[PDB]
Amino acid sequence: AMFQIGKMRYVSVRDFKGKVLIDIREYWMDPEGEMKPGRKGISLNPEQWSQLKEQISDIDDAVRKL
Amino acid sequence: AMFQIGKMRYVSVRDFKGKVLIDIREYWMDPEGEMKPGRKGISLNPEQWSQLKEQISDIDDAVRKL
DNA sequence: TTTTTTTTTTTTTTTG
């Protein structure tokens, strides 16, 4: 499953060899016309995703002060 | 501001060249003993961060439907 | 690894 957050950026959910991964990644279009994952991105495990969500408020507060 | 979400992972909020960035990244330690941002990561603008939050419910649903 | 939005390539090819 893919969820768009930018023109060429998505959050994807997948089971990778038995591990749940939540990837936040940029994608590109290659010379052959194929959509490919980019070097910019990161794949979060369950606990990392859980902690990201738990601190959304603190993250937004930080953004706001900027 | 940095918000830890994993052993070597954080969501950092900073201003870069007058731009607010929400970076989800893995860090590492170099040969001189300095902690540095790593290659695995992605810097989101406030807009992308907003779209990520809006789809958390859908993301978690996809995790369950795996 | 050496971050770093947006980019029109900038030149990648996911996976704790």
UniProtKB/Swiss-Prot annotation, chains A, B:
Keywords, in A-Z order: Acetylation, Activator, DNA-binding, Isopeptide bond, Nucleus, Phosphoprotein, Transcription, Transcription regulation, Ubl conjugation
Cross-link (Glycyl lysine isopeptide (Lys-Gly) (interchain with G-Cter in SUMO1)): K7
Residues found modified as Phosphoserine: S57
Modified residues (N6-acetyllysine): K7
Cross-link (Glycyl lysine isopeptide (Lys-Gly) (interchain with G-Cter in SUMO2)): K7
MF annotations from Gene Ontology: identical protein binding; RNA binding; RNA polymerase II cis-regulatory region sequence-specific DNA binding; single-stranded DNA binding; transcription coactivator activity
Effect of K7G: Reduced ssDNA binding
GO cellular component: extracellular exosome; nucleolus; nucleoplasm; nucleus; transcription regulator complex
Claim: Metal-binding is one of the keywords in the record: no
Post-translational events: Activity is controlled by protein kinases that target the regulatory region. Phosphorylation inactivates both ds DNA-binding and cofactor function, but does not affect binding to ssDNA. Seems to be phosphorylated in vivo by CK2 in at least 7 sites in the N-terminal Ser-rich region.
Entry's transmembrane regions: none
Major subcellular site: nucleus
Start and end residues of each stretch annotated as Interaction with ssDNA: 16-40
Function: General coactivator that functions cooperatively with TAFs and mediates functional interactions between upstream activators and the general transcriptional machinery. May be involved in stabilizing the multiprotein transcription complex. Binds single-stranded DNA. Also binds, in vitro, non-specifically to double-stranded DNA (ds DNA).
Subunit (UniProt): Homodimer. Interacts with CSTF2.
Protein name as annotated: Activated RNA polymerase II transcriptional coactivator p15
Source organism per UniProt: Homo sapiens
